[PDB]
C-alpha cells in the first residue's frame, strides 16, 4: 500500500525533525547524528517511493513522496546549518535539487496534456524545493540563479 | 496605546463571535454532534493561541488568563470526548480528540512560559503525557488489529505529544523528561518504519 508507506514516511521525517530539536536543545552530539541518520533514511525512502510511483504512472503519489523528500532535505539542511557542516549542506541541497528535477518532469507532462490540477501540484513541489536551496543561502551568485528560476516559475503558472 | 486599544477591541469582537457559535452548538444538543464538537474545540485552541499572542505584546494579563482558561476547557472536553469515543469503539474520533488535547497543551505550556506559573506548566505536561499514553495504547491496539492507517495516525499524535513534552523539558530544568520524550519520538519513528516495511511486502 503506497498510501501506507507515504503516511509512514511523513511520521518518520516529522520524528527526525523532533529528534534534531531534542538533540540541539540538550546539546547532545551523538543524538544529533541519530536525527540526521533518520532524515537521510527518509530521503532515501522518499526518492525510491517517488521513483517507483513515477515508473508506475501514479504522479500524484510521486509528488507527495517528493514533498517528503523536500522536507527531509530541510531537516538535513537545518542540522548542517546549526553544525556548520558544508558537506552535509551540499548533500541536503542535492536532495532538494533532485526533488525539483523530478517535479519538473511531472510538471512538463501535466502541462503537455493540459492536466492543470496535476500541473499546479508539481509547481508547488518545485517551489518547496527552491525554498530549501534559498533557506540560509546567502550565496549571492546562487540567489541570482534562484531569482531567475522563481521568475520562470511565475510565468509558467501565469501562462497556464 | 490607541492602536493597542483597537487590537483589543478586535480580539474582544472575535471572542464574542466565537462564543455565539458555542451558544449555537450548545442549543443544537437539544436535537442532536461529535465531529463538529471536536472541530469547535480545535477553533477554541486556535483562538486561545491568537489571544495569548496579542496579550503577550500588550502586557494584557487579563487577556492572557482568558486564553489559558479557554485552552483548559478545550483540553478538558477533548479528553472527555476521547474517553467516550474509545468506549464507543470510535477510535478515529478518539485520535482526533487526542490531537486537540496536544494542541491545547502546547498553548498552555507557552502561556506558562510567558507568565511564570508552575501549576499551569505541570498541567500542560500532564495533558501531553496523557495524550501520549493514549496515542501509544491506540497505536498498539490498531497495530495488533492490522489497522495500519489508524496506527500511523496514532503515532503522529505520539510524536506531537513528545515534541511538546520535550520543549517543556528544555524550558524547565527537567532532564529526565527530555529522555522520556526522546523515547516516545524514537518509538513513533521505529513503529512507523515497521509499518512502512510491512506495506512494501
Amino acid at each position: 500500500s503506497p498510501r501506507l508507506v507515504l503516511r509512514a514516511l511523513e511520521n518518520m521525517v516529522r520524528a527526525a525533525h523532533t529528534l534534531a530539536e531534542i538533540a540541539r536543545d540538550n546539546g547532545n552530539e551523538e543524538w544529533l547524528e541519530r536525527a540526521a541518520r533518520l532524515a537521510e533514511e527518509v530521503a532515501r525512502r522518499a526518492e525510491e517511493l517517488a521513483r517507483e510511483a513515477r515508473e508506475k504512472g501514479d504522479l500524484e503519489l510521486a509528488l507527495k513522496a517528493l514533498q517528503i523528500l523536500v522536507n527531509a532535505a530541510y531537516v538535513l539542511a537545518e542540522i548542517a546549518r546549526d553544525r556548520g557542516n558544508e558537506e552535509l549542506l551540499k548533500k541536503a541541497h542535492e536532495l532538494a535539487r533532485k526533488a525539483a528535477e523530478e517535479a519538473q518532469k511531472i510538471a512538463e507532462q501535466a502541462r503537455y496534456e493540459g492536466n492543470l490540477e496535476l500541473f499546479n501540484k508539481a509547481l508547488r513541489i518545485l517551489l518547496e524545493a527552491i525554498r530549501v536551496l534559498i533557506e540560509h543561502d546567502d550565496s549571492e551568485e546562487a540567489a541570482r540563479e534562484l531569482i531567475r528560476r522563481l521568475e520562470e516559475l511565475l510565468e509558467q503558472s501565469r501562462r497556464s | 496605546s490607541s492602536l493597542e486599544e483597537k487590537i483589543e477591541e478586535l480580539v474582544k469582537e472575535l471572542i464574542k463571535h466565537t462564543e455565539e457559535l458555542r451558544r449555537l452548538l450548545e442549543k443544537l444538543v437539544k436535537e442532536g454532534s461529535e465531529e463538529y464538537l471536536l472541530e469547535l474545540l480545535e477553533n477554541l485552541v486556535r483562538l486561545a493561541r491568537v489571544i495569548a499572542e496579542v496579550a503577550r505584546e500588550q502586557g494584557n494579563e487579563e487577556l492572557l488568563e482568558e486564553a489559558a482558561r479557554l485552552a483548559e476547557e478545550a483540553a478538558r472536553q477533548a479528553e472527555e470526548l476521547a474517553r467516550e469515543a474509545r468506549y464507543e469503539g470510535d477510535l478515529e474520533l478518539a485520535l482526533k480528540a487526542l490531537q486537540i488535547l496536544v494542541n491545547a497543551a502546547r498553548v498552555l505550556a507557552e502561556i506558562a512560559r510567558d507568565r511564570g506559573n508552575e501549576e499551569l506548566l505541570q498541567k500542560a505536561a500532564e495533558l501531553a503525557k496523557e495524550a501520549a499514553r493514549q496515542a501509544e495504547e491506540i497505536a498498539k491496539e490498531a497495530r495488533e488489529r492490522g489497522n495500519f492507517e489508524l496506527a500511523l495516525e496514532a503515532l503522529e499524535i505520539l510524536n506531537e505529544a513528545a515534541r511538546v513534552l520535550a520543549r517543556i523539558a528544555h524550558h524547565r530544568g527537567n532532564q529526565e523528561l527530555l529522555e522520556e520524550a526522546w523515547r516516545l519520538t524514537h518509538r513513533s519513528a521505529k513503529w512507523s518504519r515497521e509499518i512502512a516495511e510491512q506495506a512494501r511486502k
Partner: protein, 141 residues
C-alpha cells in the same frame, strides 16, 4: 472546478511571489521585488472578485476558500511592505485584510442563521486566522 482551479493557481502565484520578494530584496533586485509585489497585489484582487462572484451564486464554501487566499495575499503583501518601509503598500495590505475579515464575518452570520454548522465552523476558523493576520499587519507599522 474552474474557479476552484483558479484559486489553486492564485495561491501558488502568491507563494511564488512571497519567495521571490524575499530573495529579490536580499540581493537588491528592485525589478524582481516590484514584480513580486504586483503579483501579490493582483492575486488579492482576483481572490476578492472570485469571493464576490461566489457570494453572488450563493456558494459560500467557495467564497470562504477565495477569502482565505485573499487573507494570505494580504499577509504576503504586508510582509513585503514592512521590509521596505512602504507605508502605502502596508495600508493597502491592511485594507485587504480588513475587507476579507468583514466578508468572512458576514458569511459566518449567514451560515449560523441557516443552521449550516459545517460551513460555520470553517468560517469561524478563517475568522480567527484573518484576525491574526490583521493584528500582525497593524503591529509592524
Amino acid at each position: 472546478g474552474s474557479l476552484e482551479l483558479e484559486l489553486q493557481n492564485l495561491e501558488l502565484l502568491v507563494h511564488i511571489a512571497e519567495v521571490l520578494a524575499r530573495l529579490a530584496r536580499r540581493t537588491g533586485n528592485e525589478e524582481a521585488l516590484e514584480h513580486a509585489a504586483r503579483v501579490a497585489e493582483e492575486v488579492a484582487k482576483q481572490a476578492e472578485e472570485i469571493a464576490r462572484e461566489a457570494r453572488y451564486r450563493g456558494d459560500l464554501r467557495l467564497a470562504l476558500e477565495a477569502l482565505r487566499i485573499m487573507v494570505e495575499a494580504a499577509r504576503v503583501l504586508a510582509e513585503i511592505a514592512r521590509e521596505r518601509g512602504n507605508e502605502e503598500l502596508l495600508q493597502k495590505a491592511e485594507e485587504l485584510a480588513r475587507e476579507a475579515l468583514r466578508q468572512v464575518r458576514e458569511i459566518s452570520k449567514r451560515l449560523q442563521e441557516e443552521g449550516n454548522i459545517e460551513l460555520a465552523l470553517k468560517a469561524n476558523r478563517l475568522l480567527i486566522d484573518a484576525l491574526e493576520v490583521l493584528v500582525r499587519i497593524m503591529r509592524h507599522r
